[PDB]
Scaffold this active site. Structure first.
Site: not given
Ligand SMILES: CC(=O)/N=c1\sc(S(N)(=O)=O)nn1C
Ligand SMILES: [Zn+2]
Length: 257
Positions: A61, A91, A93, A103, A116, A195-196
């Site tokens: 993802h 990570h 996006h 985002e 992020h 946000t996922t």
């Molecule tokens: C850091 C982790 O294990 N998970 C995440 S970080 C995230 S986010 N995109 O940073 O809001 N969404 N999720 C599902």
């Molecule tokens: Zn994220």
């Protein structure tokens, strides 16, 4: 399974994760003229000098770089936070085109990508506990705009070929995340969510005002990743971003005037 495609994308998520229609969902549009300056807000404290990166993974993802969070090595403090938050991973996006990919948006402007840096509140002892608390996580959001290359990002870009498909991982030690920060740490902050999926509303969002710039060649590399696993039909990893959600009963605060 959830994803970003036409049949399993963000507008479908609520069928398996009803909190998708929750009261404090992320991301949001940041309206700069209605954000509220809060001079009680403290400066951010980023202490990454002892960070220990371990691995980079294509999680199907996005791709994430993981850190040792077994002790207070790399922590975030200050800002709107109480207590200390340990870095566990970062990570990105990004979009299929330079005019989309972030985002969060700022006065409806989209950026090419969004970084992020995820941290969890050490009073809860481990990450799985922290996500069950309203103050469990603190995510640092940094915008990417296309322009000049970011030297500190090239080591990441150079190993993407080795984790092209879902579930591939590679040793990724001695990476210093300080090379990904803008010069200024001014920020906006609001209470929000992951946000996922599972979209838990456990995040204090800290979104930096100043974007970092990367080159077109750098973001192009992002776009060569695959959502699919090896031996599967190729689907390029692009547009893995969730659209802005209603702000509802929330105020965005600013650290700067
Ligand atoms: C850091 C982790 O294990 N998970 C995440 S970080 C995230 S986010 N995109 O940073 O809001 N969404 N999720 C599902
Ligand atoms: Zn994220």
């Amino acid at each position: 399974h959830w994803g970003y495609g036409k049949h399993n994308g963000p507008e479908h998520w609520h069928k398996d994760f009803p909190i998708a229609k929750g009261e404090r969902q992320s991301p949001v549009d940041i309206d700069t003229h209605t954000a509220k300056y809060d001079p009680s807000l403290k400066p951010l404290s980023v202490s990454y000098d002892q960070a220990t990166s371990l691995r980079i993974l294509n999680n199907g993802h996005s791709f994430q770089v993981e850190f040792d969070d077994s002790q207070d090595k790399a922590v975030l403090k200050g800002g709107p936070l109480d207590g200390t938050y340990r870095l566990i991973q970062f990570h990105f996006h990004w979009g299929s085109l330079d005019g989309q990919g972030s985002e969060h948006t700022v006065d409806k402007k989209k950026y090419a990508a969004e970084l992020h840096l995820v941290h969890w509140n050490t009073k809860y002892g481990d990450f799985g506990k922290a996500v069950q608390q309203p103050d469990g996580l603190a995510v640092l959001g940094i915008f990417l705009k296309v322009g000049s290359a970011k030297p500190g990002l090239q080591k990441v870009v150079d190993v993407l070929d080795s984790i092209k498909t879902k579930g591939k991982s590679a040793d990724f030690t001695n990476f210093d995340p300080r090379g990904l920060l803008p010069e200024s740490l001014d920020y906006w902050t609001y209470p929000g969510s992951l946000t996922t999926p599972p979209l838990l509303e456990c995040v204090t969002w800290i979104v930096l005002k100043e974007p970092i710039s990367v080159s077109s060649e750098q973001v192009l590399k992002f776009r060569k990743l695959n959502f699919n696993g090896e031996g599967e039909p190729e689907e390029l990893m692009v547009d893995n971003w969730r659209p802005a959600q209603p702000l509802k009963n929330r105020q965005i605060k600013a650290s700067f005037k």
